[PDB]
Write a structure and sequence with these properties.
Largest interface: A-B, 76 and 65 residues
Shape of chain A: elongated
Number of domains of chain B: 4
CATH architecture of the largest domain in chain A: Roll
Shape of chain B: elongated
Number of strands of chain A: 23
Number of domains of chain A: 5
Radius of gyration of chain A: 34 Å
Structural class of chain B: alpha+beta
CATH architecture of the largest domain in chain B: Roll
Oligomer: heterodimer
CATH class of the largest domain in chain A: Alpha Beta
Strand order of the largest sheet of chain A: 14-13-12-16-17
Bound molecules: ligand K5C, magnesium ion
Strand content of chain B: 15-25%
Number of strands of chain B: 16
Order of helices and strands of chain B: HEEEHEEEHEEHEEHHEHEEEHEHEH
Radius of gyration of chain B: 25 Å
CATH topology of the largest domain in chain B: HIV Type 1 Reverse Transcriptase, Chain A, domain 1
């Protein structure tokens, strides 16, 4: 017999104030009882479980299940109640590596570490809470009562404790074979290396010879997989990766559940298939919950879907990461708040692709959205590769410099270069910093009645030009914008505008280039046609002329 | 020091469960090396999966030093750690620190690692060095000693610090020493000549008690509410007068007795913005009376220690930033302006981060606490970049301004 090291037990407690589970065992058929007795006798011989006396007051129900061709039963212990009562753990498995962040390895193998799982002992003081009862035949004797000595399948703490235990066992092996990489998830263990295959299979042998010091049996994974390896939705070839094939169904009747799983496929595909778009197909789900409702796909949703089918026409592939090369991210504007991007090291060999969609807002502009896309890609790149990429952006350097030097917020984007691929992001208007000599001055005002919603909007100018239009179904805020719009419509290419509307100044000083308000949009289109606009603000109701005269004109 | 001080969270709240944000590879590597040495020195230990807590960590470089330093973001733990009446029921913030000619900031965070942390509280100091690309589980640690940046550390160390310093204080009754978090602030009315010496005099005095070569020198002789200033002009356009009436109307919410009637009357009719309007005598007098009102201090401002301090910042362009500190709107307790942010002439965010640190420092000197910032920046831009330029071992709270304030005009 060879001494094996004990695996260090993790201390576990129940949530404060909570006791263990006390759930009654369901009655079972005579055949299920017989099958459960057979199974638990075997588990008991392997040290997994142990018989307890009647002193333990906790209980978790146990069931017997089957399958189609599997002519025998398996044991299911239902730990739902215990899991609700068990303390929270550090669960350290929630993300997986992105293939584009991986480095190519000459050799890679998968190990099955399923057996090692139940050689992880369970904290002694916690076992009592795992008790379960095999009901007796005809209920004429006491039930056979057992508790777990190892992490039970289904118990809340078993994934984190098993993973944490393996990590600690593996740490010496990894740290002292720096030419190896080891990755663990579920009961699978992945080893990769750049060793010729002779010495790789021996490092594998050394690894089970390391695992055996804790008495952990690890054979080669039964029925091995060969290139590509299929893993977490990907295909990993030795020198390239891609996603598992994406198939979009044809349907003449789409439901909201059909659609939201079309977006999921498209979202999945968008990490390597450049230019995927999902806004129009996401638009058909803004607000609904009974998810077999049919939706007419708009012809805008159909063109988007048909555009997606064309990009999906082919397989595409990404390459693995080379740390000795630069990391580059290029972004293109797609329209309607949509952006796409490719991350690469050599031209035409993408590491991965992606997309970004405009946040929900009343008004917005292209430069702000490009900035957000940059920040999203920055953070993703830090996750994946541990560094910020150099950016190639469809915005002229002078456009950016004008934007950030004049914009009222602080803003910044990291090292980047202009790439001349239309449509380019541009500033569509810029207001004057000073009043314009020789340009006509328009004093604008609007006003509406709360009850009737009847309003007026208009202007008076230093040349005696004047206009007031009566309006229905309006509000003060709309009349204030409508007045600015009238002044832009009726003036020459250079114009000074004086308003008392803090609301309208707040919108325009935000520099939107597109809006949810058709009226704001009309103002933007006018601004674009102008050569110079100066917008001045004055307080209302304070006797300042022009503003005084137009105020009386529009206030009934 | 063998005997730990018992510490608890506030009643009915668990420890922090804050997500670690992603880190670049060079910061991860720096943190691995620092923590390996800390773990060898007993200051931190590896923890197991039964600890579900987490506090974020990153790595910085203190102002113009080239060695990485670990910074733990204890904001959540500090909010959840019991209020501290440690050996006192309150340590008077020295109201005379803000008046001293020169104040030097000394990092003494290293002294905290001499004191064990309560064994029952250690699990709440959990933090994670993240992996790149989820390629390994993060490295999980908890503190065994008082950590830098935690609210309880100056509180629990206060008994030792006052005794370490008392021989120096006995010799120097002129010198104010104030502790906030990891830093000592040392003020004197004498010139930098003998100030540096006394600073190193104090510094080597810490060496004989079981230290850091760095400092930072402030002059709180400046710190006021800046006056509202009106233009002095020989010819006024319509536009100039409109801007003046707008500024005065804004100031009438702060100051009583501001009048714009006689100035507004100059704007009779519908005139071109660039047309020159002579000032009458009545408008001239009104302007003069307004000028007279604005040189006196604002009526009814003082600091309520029960209330948050709020700090607002405006980007003014060309490297200039204005700010105001207040508790109630229009009752500014301090206003200020910065320019030429060092090594940042093309990076707005770096400039903003330095201004935030500069304002927080003034706030600690004046009141002994940090303000809640209203930052003129979109959240995703700030959240992506601020840690890149942060150099302080404390971190204030902040919120984001998405609508441009008209008041920027009035502070420019
Ligand atoms: C994350 C990960 C996944 C797998 C999946 C297996 C399956 N199902 C395997 C390993 C080692 C993983 O973990 C890491 N993988 C890498 N690189 C990879 C290694 C594998 N190649 C693909 C490949 C190479 C050679 C052959 S071959 N010639 O033997 O048939 C077949 C396939 C892609 C890059 N780097 C790291 C760094 C830290 S962990 C880790
Ligand atoms: Mg009006």
């Amino acid at each position: 017999m060879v001494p094996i090291s004990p695996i260090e037990t993790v201390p576990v407690k129940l949530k404060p104030g909570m006791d263990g589970p006390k759930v009654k065992q369901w009655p079972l058929t005579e055949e299920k009882i017989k099958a459960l007795v057979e199974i638990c006798t075997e588990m008991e011989k392997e040290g997994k479980i142990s018989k307890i006396g009647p002193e333990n007051p906790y209980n978790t129900p146990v069931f017997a299940i089957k399958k189609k061709d599997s002519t025998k039963w398996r044991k299911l212990v239902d730990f739902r109640e215990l899991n609700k009562r068990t303390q929270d753990f550090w669960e350290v498995q929630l993300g997986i590596p992105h293939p584009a962040g991986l480095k190519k390895k000459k050799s890679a193998t998968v190990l099955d570490v399923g057996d090692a799982y139940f050689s992880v002992p369970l904290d002694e003081d916690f076992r009592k809470y795992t008790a379960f009862t095999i009901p007796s035949i005809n209920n004429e004797t006491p039930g056979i009562r057992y508790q777990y000595n190892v992490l039970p399948q289904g118990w809340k703490g078993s994934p984190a404790i098993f993973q944490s235990s393996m990590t600690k066992i593996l740490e010496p092996f990894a740290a002292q074979n720096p030419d190896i990489v080891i990755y663990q998830y579920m009961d699978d263990l992945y080893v990769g290396s750049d060793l010729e295959i002779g010495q790789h299979r021996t490092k594998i042998e050394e690894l089970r010879q390391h695992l055996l010091r804790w008495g952990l049996t690890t054979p080669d994974k039964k029925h091995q997989k060969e290139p590509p390896l299929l893993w977490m939705g990907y295909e990993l070839h030795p020198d390239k990766w891609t996603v598992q094939p994406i198939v979009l169904p044809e349907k003449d009747s789409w439901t909201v559940n059909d659609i939201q799983k079309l977006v999921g496929k498209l979202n999945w595909a968008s990490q390597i298939y450049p230019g995927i778009k999902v806004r129009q197909l996401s638009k058909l789900l803004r607000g609904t919950k009974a998810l077999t409702e049919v939706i007419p796909l708009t012809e805008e949703a159909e063109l988007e879907l048909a555009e997606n089918r064309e990009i999906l026409k082919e397989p595409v592939h990404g390459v693995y990461y080379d740390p000795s090369k630069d990391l580059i991210a290029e972004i293109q504007k797609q329209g309607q708040g949509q952006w796409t991007y490719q991350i690469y090291q050599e031209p035409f060999k993408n590491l991965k692709t992606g997309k970004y969609a405009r946040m929900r807002g009343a008004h917005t502009n292209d430069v702000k959205q490009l900035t957000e896309a940059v920040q999203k890609i920055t953070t993703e790149s830090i996750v994946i590769w541990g560094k910020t990429p150099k950016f190639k952006l469809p915005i002229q350097k002078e456009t950016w410099e004008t934007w950030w030097t004049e914009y009222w917020q602080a803003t910044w984007i990291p090292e980047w270069e202009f790439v001349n691929t239309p449509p380019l992001v541009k500033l569509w208007y810029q207001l004057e910093k000073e009043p314009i000599v020789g340009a006509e001055t328009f004093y604008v005002d609007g006003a509406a009645n709360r009850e009737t919603k009847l309003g007026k909007a208009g202007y008076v100018t230093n040349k005696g030009r004047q206009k007031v239009v009566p309006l229905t179904n309006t509000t003060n805020q709309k009349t204030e914008l409508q007045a600015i719009y009238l002044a832009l419509q009726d003036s020459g290419l250079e114009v000074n505008i004086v308003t008392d509307s803090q609301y309208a100044l707040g919108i325009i000083q935000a520099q939107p280039d597109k809006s949810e308000s058709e009226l704001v949009n009309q103002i933007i289109e006018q601004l674009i046609k102008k050569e110079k606009v100066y917008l001045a603000w004055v307080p209302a109701h304070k006797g300042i002329g022009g503003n005084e005269q137009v105020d009386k004109l529009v206030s009934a | 020091p063998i005997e730990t001080v018992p510490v608890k969270l506030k009643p009915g709240m668990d420890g922090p469960k804050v997500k670690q944000w992603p880190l670049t590879e060079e910061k991860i590597k720096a943190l691995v090396e620092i923590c390996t040495e800390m773990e060898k020195e007993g200051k931190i230990s590896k923890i197991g999966p039964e600890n579900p807590y987490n506090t974020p960590v990153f790595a910085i470089k203190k102002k113009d030093s080239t060695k990485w330093r670990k910074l733990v973001d204890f904001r959540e733990l500090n909010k959840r750690t019991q209020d501290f009446w440690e050996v006192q029921l309150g340590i008077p913030h020295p109201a005379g620190l803000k008046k001293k000619k020169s104040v030097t900031v000394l990092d003494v965070g290293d002294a905290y690692f001499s004191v064990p942390l309560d064994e029952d509280f250690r699990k709440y100091t959990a933090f994670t060095i993240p992996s790149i690309n989820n390629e390994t589980p993060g490295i999980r640690y908890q503190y065994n000693v008082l950590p830098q940046g935690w609210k309880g550390s100056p509180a629990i160390f206060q008994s030792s610090m006052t005794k370490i310093l008392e021989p120096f204080k006995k010799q120097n009754p002129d010198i104010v020493i104030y502790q906030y978090m990891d830093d000592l602030y040392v003020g004197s009315d004498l010139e930098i000549g003998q100030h540096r010496t006394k600073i190193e005099e104090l510094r080597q005095h810490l060496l004989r008690w079981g230290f850091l070569w760095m400092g930072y020198e402030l002059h709180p002789d400046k710190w006021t509410v800046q006056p509202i200033v009106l233009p002095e002009k020989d010819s006024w356009t319509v536009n100039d007068i409109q801007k003046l009436v707008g500024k005065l109307n804004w100031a009438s919410q702060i100051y009583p007795g501001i009048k714009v009637r006689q100035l507004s009357k100059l704007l009779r009719g519908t005139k071109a913005l660039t047309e020159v309007i002579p000032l009458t005598e009545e408008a001239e007098l009104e302007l003069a009376e307004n000028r007279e009102i604005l040189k006196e201090p604002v009526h009814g401002v003082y600091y309520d220690p029960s209330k948050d301090l709020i700090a607002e910042i405006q980007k003014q362009g060309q490297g200039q930033w204005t700010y105001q500190i207040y508790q109630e709107p229009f009752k500014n307790l301090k206003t200020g302006k910065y320019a030429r942010m060092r090594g940042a002439h093309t990076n707005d965010v770096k400039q903003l981060t330095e201004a935030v640190q500069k304002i927080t420092t003034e706030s600690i000197v004046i009141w002994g606490k940090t303000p809640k910032f209203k930052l003129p920046i979109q959240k995703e831009t700030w959240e992506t970049w601020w840690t890149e330029y942060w150099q302080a071992t404390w971190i204030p709270e902040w919120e984001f301004v998405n609508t441009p304030p008209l008041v920027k005009l009035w502070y420019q």
